[PDB]
Amino acid sequence: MTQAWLWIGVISMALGSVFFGFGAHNAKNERWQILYTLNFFICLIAAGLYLAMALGLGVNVIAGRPTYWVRFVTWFCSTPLLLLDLTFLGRTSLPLTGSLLGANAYMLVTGFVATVTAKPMSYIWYIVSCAAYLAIVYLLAQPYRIAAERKHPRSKQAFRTLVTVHLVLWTLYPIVWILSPEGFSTFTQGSETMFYTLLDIASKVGFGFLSLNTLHTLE
Amino acid sequence: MTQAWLWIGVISMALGSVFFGFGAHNAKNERWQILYTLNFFICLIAAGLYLAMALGLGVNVIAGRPTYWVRFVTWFCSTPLLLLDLTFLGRTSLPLTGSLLGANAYMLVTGFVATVTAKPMSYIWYIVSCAAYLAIVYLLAQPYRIAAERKHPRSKQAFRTLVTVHLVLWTLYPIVWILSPEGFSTFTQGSETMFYTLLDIASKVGFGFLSLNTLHTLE
Amino acid sequence: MTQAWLWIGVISMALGSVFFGFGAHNAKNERWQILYTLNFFICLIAAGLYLAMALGLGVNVIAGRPTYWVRFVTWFCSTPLLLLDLTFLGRTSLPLTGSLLGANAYMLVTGFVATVTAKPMSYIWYIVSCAAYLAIVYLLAQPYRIAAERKHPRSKQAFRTLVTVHLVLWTLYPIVWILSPEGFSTFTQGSETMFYTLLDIASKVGFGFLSLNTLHTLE
Numbered sequence: 341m342t343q344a345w346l347w348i349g350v351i352s353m354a355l356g357s358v359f360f361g362f363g364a365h366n367a368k369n370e371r372w373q374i375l376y377t378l379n380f381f382i383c384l385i386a387a388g389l390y391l392a393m394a395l396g397l398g399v400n401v402i403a404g405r406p407t408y409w410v411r412f413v414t415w416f417c418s419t420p421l422l423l424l425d426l427t428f429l430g431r432t433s434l435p436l437t438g439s440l441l442g443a444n445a446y447m448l449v450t451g452f453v454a455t456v457t458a459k460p461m462s463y464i465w466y467i468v469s470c471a472a473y474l475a476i477v478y479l480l481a482q483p484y485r486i487a488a489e490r491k492h493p494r495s496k497q498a499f500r501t502l503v504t505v506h507l508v509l510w511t512l513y514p515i516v517w518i519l520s521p522e523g524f525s526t527f528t529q530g531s532e533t534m535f536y537t538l539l540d541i542a543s544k545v546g547f548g549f550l551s552l553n554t555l556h557t558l559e
Numbered sequence: 560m561t562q563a564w565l566w567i568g569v570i571s572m573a574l575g576s577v578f579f580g581f582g583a584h585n586a587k588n589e590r591w592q593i594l595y596t597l598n599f600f601i602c603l604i605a606a607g608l609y610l611a612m613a614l615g616l617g618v619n620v621i622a623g624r625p626t627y628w629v630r631f632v633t634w635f636c637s638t639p640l641l642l643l644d645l646t647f648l649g650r651t652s653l654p655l656t657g658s659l660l661g662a663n664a665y666m667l668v669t670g671f672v673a674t675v676t677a678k679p680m681s682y683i684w685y686i687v688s689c690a691a692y693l694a695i696v697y698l699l700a701q702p703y704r705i706a707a708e709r710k711h712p713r714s715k716q717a718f719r720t721l722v723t724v725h726l727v728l729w730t731l732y733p734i735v736w737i738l739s740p741e742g743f744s745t746f747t748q749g750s751e752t753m754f755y756t757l758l759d760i761a762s763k764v765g766f767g768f769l770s771l772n773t774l775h776t777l778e
Numbered sequence: 779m780t781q782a783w784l785w786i787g788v789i790s791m792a793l794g795s796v797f798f799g800f801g802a803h804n805a806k807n808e809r810w811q812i813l814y815t816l817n818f819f820i821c822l823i824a825a826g827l828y829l830a831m832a833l834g835l836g837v838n839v840i841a842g843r844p845t846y847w848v849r850f851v852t853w854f855c856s857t858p859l860l861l862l863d864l865t866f867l868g869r870t871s872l873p874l875t876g877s878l879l880g881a882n883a884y885m886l887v888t889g890f891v892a893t894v895t896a897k898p899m900s901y902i903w904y905i906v907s908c909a910a911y912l913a914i915v916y917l918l919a920q921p922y923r924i925a926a927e928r929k930h931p932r933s934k935q936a937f938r939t940l941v942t943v944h945l946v947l948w949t950l951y952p953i954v955w956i957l958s959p960e961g962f963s964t965f966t967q968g969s970e971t972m973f974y975t976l977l978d979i980a981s982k983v984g985f986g987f988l989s990l991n992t993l994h995t996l997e
């Protein structure tokens with residue numbers, strides 16, 4: 341089961357890479373080329389992640405369960421680019437962009453510690469990582485969105501759908517984590533891999549398509 | 560003894576995080592918000608460090624002594640932000656900012672190698688790391704300070720006190736290192752932890768308060 | 779044999795560091811200081827690499843062969859600076875600079891995986907890493923070079939020689955890799971070290987001299 345969803349991730353991310361790489365080469369202006377290139381590297385990093393996991397790399401058992409710690413290494417490089425998708429479309433100020441990238445880097449490193457620590461202590465770092473995620477939720481839902489609507493007042497719903505889809509998908513990750521083997525262990529290890537794979541595909545390929553649709557709406 | 564000073568670091572850095580996080584939310588202009596946000600992440604990274612050390616993480620014995628190698632991982636992210644405190648207040652040119660961040664990154668990585676190497680060879684990397692620190696001392700005491708005084712000629716002592724306090728505190732770190740177990744081993748491992756904890760608190764919380772006082776003097 | 783070429787690398791890179799560090803201190807304008815400082819850190823990172831390897835650090839046997847994995851750690855910081863040499867001389871746009879640094883970071887991480895993986899699977903990551911290198915070759919030979927010639931139309935051969943020398947040297951690295959023990963293992967481990975050392979010296983010290991010669995031609 342797990343090996344199948346890892347290979348589904350490889351091909352989906354790799355095929356996602358080809359499309360965005362083709363769009364970056366044939367982009368009619370620089371604004372389209374940057375967004376195409378951003379989503380291209382996002383899918384390229386994710387393809388390398390799933391190829392590594394599919395080949396049995398980047399996994400050392402913690403607490404008797406298979407733990408793909410390599411996710412946090414590639415998420416660390418791919419998730420800031422997904423935030424750059426948002427800040428580039430909204431023409432967000434660099435200070436807010438830096439707070440988003442810093443909170444995201446903090447969320448991931450502390451989420452890594454929760455994954456590879458003993459079962460009782462793990463929940464402290466989970467709470468820490470969730471608190472850092474709550475900062476991102478606030479930053480994206482309030483100051484980022486209002487700034488973006490104020491610059492593009494004829495396309496407020498475009499940014500609203502963008503932030504909603506982005507935050508619904510990101511919110512699903514700590515839900516899978518807390519219920520998977522490294523949390524309360526309510527379901528299997530194979531279902532956790534499938535969840536993250538479905539989520540990764542949506543938040544990178546699916547969201548990448550949405551970002552292009554948003555840029556066209558911005559005209 | 561050591562577990563106590565680790566927990567002193569957790570609470571002090573965490574309480575330091577709350578204050579700077581509150582000041583960033585209620586900042587009256589963007590210049591105050593950036594400085595508050597900078598010191599907020601500085602204390603947030605340091606809180607995570609001490610929480611990790613307090614919980615027995617990020618430490619593998621080298622040469623028979625307890626070695627918290629996790630310090631170098633978090634210093635690598637927190638110390639460049641402390642340099643950004645200086646360059647932001649002085650409106651330092653980006654090339655000088657890059658040399659400061661590069662010399663600082665070099666000092667820390669080579670200082671890491673000295674910490675986790677055999678006893679004789681360790682002193683080569685210590686000398687290397689100290690040489691990289693001497694570059695920072697020169698960069699901050701001469702070109703940074705003169706550039707800052709030239710832009711703020713009515714507040715030259717503000718930058719002078721700022722650089723002096725910053726460099727006195729940073730200079731104390733290699734002194735503790737060379738006399739601690741990983742150096743000539745003149746005192747215990749508990750006193751080393753207390754030294755770094757006192758120093759970390761001063762150079763992050765204490766220096767963070769000083770940076771705000773300096774910005775007010777700049778008006 | 780190998781210990782000799784490691785020490786040749788230490789002294790050559792260190793002596794290379796002194797020269798570029800002296801040129802950065804006595805630079806007559808800021809454009810010369812930036813280029814001198816860039817090549818200074820390039821040789822400083824490389825000196826630390828060879829000092830680490832000469833001292834028996836950063837090497838864990840993979841597949842029965844001595845594998846200096848520390849190369850990829852220092853290449854990761856030194857090779858983007860060598861690309862910054864090119865983009866700074868050409869006044870390259872930041873988006874193209876970002877694609878070059880991203881493709882380079884991707885080439886190195888996947889090349890690292892090929893080095894530390896089982897013998898059959900290694901060639902997949904080698905092909906991946908070579909594909910990322912081919913992107914760099916295209917980026918440097920077409921959009922970077924044409925943009926640079928268009929801004930400096932009286933010095934087109936300067937950039938042409940620069941890109942040619944840079945790409946000839948970088949191309950020699952995957953050739954050494956595929957024929958060394960971690961590839962088809964046609965020659966020894968000592969010859970691999972000598973190859974990389976000769977190549978590193980050329981692409982950092984030798985190329986550093988070339989970059990200064992190019993800047994003078996640009997006047």
Ligand SMILES: *C/C=C(C)/C=C/C=C(C)/C=C/C1=C(C)CCCC1(C)C
Binds near residue numbers: 448451
């Ligand atoms: C393409 C990859 C994406 C969108 C990754 C998203 C990851 C997160 C939103 C991380 C979530 C976590 C928490 C909020 C707390 C601790 C557990 C994590 C790391 C799953």
Ligand SMILES: *C/C=C(C)/C=C/C=C(C)/C=C/C1=C(C)CCCC1(C)C
Binds near residue numbers: 732
């Ligand atoms: C908040 C953390 C701070 C201010 C860290 C400061 C660390 C240093 C100034 C490092 C000093 C070192 C040397 C100069 C040489 C080798 C030993 C070190 C790493 C302690």
Ligand SMILES: *C/C=C(C)/C=C/C=C(C)/C=C/C1=C(C)CCCC1(C)C
Binds near residue numbers: 856885892908978
């Ligand atoms: C100063 C260091 C330099 C110029 C390093 C250059 C390294 C490369 C061009 C890397 C080449 C690789 C491939 C293209 C594929 C896999 C094997 C590598 C990592 C040697």
Ligand SMILES: CCCCCCCC/C=C/CCCCCCCC(=O)O
Binds near residue numbers: 351
């Ligand atoms: C697993 C998912 C695989 C994804 C790759 C296959 C999908 C490629 C589909 C073709 C898209 C053609 C139309 C694209 C034009 C750009 C749209 C736009 O500008 O918003």
Ligand SMILES: CCCCCCCC/C=C/CCCCCCCC(=O)O
Binds near residue numbers: 572764771775
């Ligand atoms: C271990 C140290 C704990 C630190 C947190 C407790 C200290 C908080 C004190 C309150 C400060 C209230 C006054 C601050 C106004 C800003 C000063 C300024 O603008 O320069």
Ligand SMILES: CCCCCCCC/C=C/CCCCCCCC(=O)O
Binds near residue numbers: 790793794
């Ligand atoms: C192993 C290689 C050692 C390298 C260090 C020794 C070489 C130093 C030689 C002296 C260079 C003196 C002339 C330099 C003037 C700058 C040239 C220029 O501006 O293009």
Ligand SMILES: CCCCCCCC/C=C\CCCCCCCC(=O)O
Binds near residue numbers: 388399410413891
């Ligand atoms: C810009 C960043 C580029 C990221 C590329 C992503 C592709 C590589 C993914 C992770 C590589 C991890 C390699 C693991 C080494 C083997 C150790 C193990 O088996 O546990």
Ligand SMILES: CCCCCCCC/C=C\CCCCCCCC(=O)O
Binds near residue numbers: 436442472475599
């Ligand atoms: C407990 C984990 C906290 C994670 C850190 C994130 C907290 C956010 C910190 C300060 C937010 C400041 C936002 C930057 C200002 C944006 C508004 C503007 O652009 O002017």
Ligand SMILES: CCCCCCCC/C=C\CCCCCCCC(=O)O
Binds near residue numbers: 474
């Ligand atoms: C266990 C899961 C942990 C993750 C928590 C993150 C979920 C946060 C959910 C939504 C909080 C509400 C955000 C406010 C939306 C903006 C308000 C508005 O614009 O009207």
Ligand SMILES: CCCCCCCC/C=C\CCCCCCCC(=O)O
Binds near residue numbers: 446
């Ligand atoms: C932007 C950077 C954010 C930094 C957050 C700092 C908080 C985390 C600190 C270090 C985590 C180290 C985790 C160590 C894993 C266990 C290995 C061990 O026990 O030796």
Ligand SMILES: CCCCCCCC/C=C\CCCCCCCC(=O)O
Binds near residue numbers: 694
């Ligand atoms: C031996 C370790 C050395 C560590 C590297 C640091 C050495 C500094 C190198 C060159 C300094 C150049 C400073 C940048 C110019 C600032 C002046 C300006 O802004 O114009």
Ligand SMILES: CCCCCCCC/C=C\CCCCCCCC(=O)O
Binds near residue numbers: 689692696700734
């Ligand atoms: C063993 C400890 C190693 C750390 C060494 C760092 C200490 C350096 C001490 C001060 C050097 C003098 C710096 C010159 C100050 C500026 C001169 C001036 O402005 O008048």
Ligand SMILES: CCCCCCCC/C=C\CCCCCCCC(=O)O
Binds near residue numbers: 665827838848851
């Ligand atoms: C800005 C980046 C600065 C880079 C400095 C380069 C010098 C240090 C080089 C690599 C250090 C690797 C240390 C290896 C630790 C010992 C582990 C082992 O023996 O295998």
Ligand SMILES: CCCCCCCC/C=C\CCCCCCCC(=O)O
Binds near residue numbers: 373377909
């Ligand atoms: C298979 C590994 C691929 C590695 C990633 C590199 C591929 C390059 C991706 C898109 C190239 C876009 C180049 C940026 C535009 C430069 C032109 C400009 O400045 O306007």
Ligand SMILES: CCCCCCCC/C=C\CCCCCCCC(=O)O
Binds near residue numbers: 911912915920949953
């Ligand atoms: C096994 C080695 C793998 C490395 C492959 C990289 C070698 C690529 C060689 C050259 C490809 C041709 C590049 C085109 C040059 C520009 C064309 C032109 O300007 O006329």
Ligand SMILES: [Cl-]
Binds near residue numbers: 385386
């Ligand atoms: Cl990823």
